[PDB]
Amino acid sequence: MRERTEARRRRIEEVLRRRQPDLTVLLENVHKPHNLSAILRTCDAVGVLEAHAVNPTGGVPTFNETSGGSHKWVYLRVHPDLHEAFRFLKERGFTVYATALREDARDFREVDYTKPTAVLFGAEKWGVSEEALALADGAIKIPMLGMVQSLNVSVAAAVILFEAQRQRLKAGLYDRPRLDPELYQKVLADW
Amino acid sequence: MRERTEARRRRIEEVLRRRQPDLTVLLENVHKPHNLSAILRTCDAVGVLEAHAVNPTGGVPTFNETSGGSHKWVYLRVHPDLHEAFRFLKERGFTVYATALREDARDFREVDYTKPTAVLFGAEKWGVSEEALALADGAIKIPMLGMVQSLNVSVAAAVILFEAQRQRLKAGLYDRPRLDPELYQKVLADW
Ligand SMILES: C[S@@+](CC[C@H](N)C(=O)[O-])CC1O[C@@H](n2cnc3c(N)ncnc32)[C@H](O)[C@@H]1O
Ligand SMILES: C[S@@+](CC[C@H](N)C(=O)[O-])CC1O[C@@H](n2cnc3c(N)ncnc32)[C@H](O)[C@@H]1O
């Protein structure tokens, strides 16, 4: 009885209480199942409730590599195209930053991730599309101090999301629930 | 002539001038070529000169996934076993922290990465060995605020190395060269 409630029940709610409905990622054409799986695992670790994608892993979400069965816990909304994904996020109050390898992008640590924020990541071989850069509210970049031009996409997603995790921990966002009662009770129900 | 010198020559030295001889990683039994490749790409991005491993990808370093040909730039020293890798690092003044999923590990952001530091990472399916934990100077952990217990190893390596990159950028370690003349001229030679 308490194994059923004192454990599973209590730990799941504890985690649900740290879910951030206003922190997310938009994945544009991320092709490799290992990147999709690792990015969702990272989303779970920083409390992302639902992630977004356009054309993930061929068209249908496909997992394999990481995933402490992370896709079991992080919702993944797939959009028909980039404009719909942006319409969806903007209508919900998100500021959307595209990640870019351009030298004119803003340093990723200078963004305030405690505000509703969605960060867009692009295809492994060629990055965020020109279309996506045009839609975004700004472009951000992670400093590269060596010879290579870019990081693995899952890695870039983690560097940015854990800076968001750092800021929100300090700001105290994880200290109290941030899901309305209906949403909360509804996700509590699935988990 | 200037394409040969003004470009290749100048950009390579610029990067060599940011290499950190006293910041590294020790990879214990990291099996997947995509993790090894992504971790070396991350090492390049934060200025790691040489990385270390015991039993990488089956025994012989094997790359495939990431690598802006990152293995072209980051030296990888493979050791016969864990004790030799530790002897090698300790004799050189490194403090070695093991990464652990234990709840008694220190928060990774509370480590001062501006001192000579080596961070040890373990096998994808089961983590750092009990032997490695016994050898290490301390254990550190990245906060996990969701349902999953761990992050992808390459992801964990990047979260920790970019916190090191953040601290060293502030401390000004990347602002001046930190390689002795012989080492510098020698790596300059290969690149
Ligand atoms: C292989 S990279 C970009 C590749 C593209 N062929 C290029 O050379 O611009 C994949 C992706 O990496 C990202 N990304 C990689 N390194 C990054 C960095 N240093 N800062 C910000 N985003 C980064 C993008 O978001 C995108 O999802
Ligand atoms: C799949 S994980 C650990 C797996 C192991 N089966 C376990 O459950 O403890 C691979 C590895 O992840 C690391 N690692 C993963 N998440 C981490 C976190 N939150 N903090 C510190 N190290 C982490 C380790 O360094 C190691 O290289």
Task: Single out the residue of B97, B102, B52, B96 nearest to residue B78, CA to CA.
Answer: B52
Token reading at B59:
């025994």
How many residues are there in chain A? 191
CB A78 within 8 A of CB A119: no
The CATH class that applies to domain A1-191 reads alpha beta
Go through A47-60 and write b for each residue having 16 or more CB atoms within 10 A of its CB, e for each that does not: bbbebbbbbbbeee
List C-alpha distances in Å: A81 to A76, A98, A179, B87: 15, 16, 27, 54
Strand partners of residue B95: B117
- The DSSP call for residue A2 is T
Task: Give the DSSP H or E segment for A23.
Answer: strand A23-28
CB A70 within 8 A of CB A44: yes
φ/ψ bin of B59: left (φ > 0), alpha (ψ from -120 to 50), beta (otherwise): left
Show me where the domains of chain A are located. Answer: 1-191
Nearest C-alpha in A relative to B148: A68
Inter-axis angle of helices A153-171 and B153-171, to 10 degrees?
A: 60
Residue with tokens 């061929």: A58
C-alpha B58: how far from chain center: 19
Burial of B116 per CB tally in 10 Å (0-12, 13-18, 19+): middle
Q: Of all atoms in ligand 1, which is nearest to the CA of residue B66?
A: 1
Task: Single out the residue of A145, A99, A84, A23 nearest to residue B166, CA to CA.
Answer: A145
Q: Which residues have a Cβ under 8 Å from the Cβ of A65 and sit 6 or more positions away?
A: A33, A34, A37, A38, B34, B152
Task: Give the DSSP H or E segment for B39.
Answer: helix B33-46
Q: How far apart are the first and last CA of chain A?
A: 18
User: Order of strands across the sheet with B50-54?
Assistant: B75-78, B50-54, B23-28, B117-121, B95-99, B138-141, B106-107
Q: How was this structure determined?
A: X-ray
| Ramachandran angles phi, psi of B135, nearest 5° | -70, -40
H helices of B5-32, in order, are: 10-16
Of B15, B109, B149, the CB nearest to A147: B15
Transcribe B128-170 into DSSP letters: S-HHHHHHSSEEEE----SS-S---HHHHHHHHHHHHHHHHHH
List C-alpha distances in Å: A84 to A31, A40, A90: 20, 21, 10
Of B37, B72, B143, the CB nearest to A165: B143
Task: Give the DSSP H or E segment for A24.
Answer: strand A23-28
The SS3 of residue A114 is: coil
Inter-axis angle of helices A153-171 and A33-46, to 10 degrees?
A: 10
B112 Cα–ligand 2 center, Å: 21
Residue A154 to residue B155, Cβ atoms within 8 A: yes
Residue with tokens 């602002």: B175
B123 Cα–ligand 2 center, Å: 8
Burial of B60 per CB tally in 10 Å (0-12, 13-18, 19+): exposed
Nearest C-alpha in B relative to A12: B147
Residue A145 to residue B47, Cβ atoms within 8 A: yes
Q: How far apart are CA B49 and CA B40, in angstroms?
A: 10
Q: Which residues have a Cβ under 8 Å from the Cβ of A41 and sit 6 or more positions away?
A: A66, A67, A68, A70, B148, B151, B152, B155
Q: How far apart are CA B115 and CA A179, in angstroms?
A: 41
* Beta-carbon count within 10 A of A9 CB: 14
Q: How far apart are CA B14 and CA B73, in angstroms?
A: 14
Transcribe A126-183 into DSSP letters: TBS-HHHHHHSSEEEE----SS-S---HHHHHHHHHHHHHHHHHHHTGGGS--S-HHH
Q: How far apart are CA A153 and CA A123, in angstroms?
A: 8
- Does the CB of B12 have a partner CB in chain A at under 8 Å? yes
CB A36 within 8 A of CB B147: no
Task: Single out the residue of A106, A88, A116 nearest to residue A24, CA to CA.
Answer: A116
- Give me the torsion for CA of B178, B183, B185, B188, rounded to 10°: -80
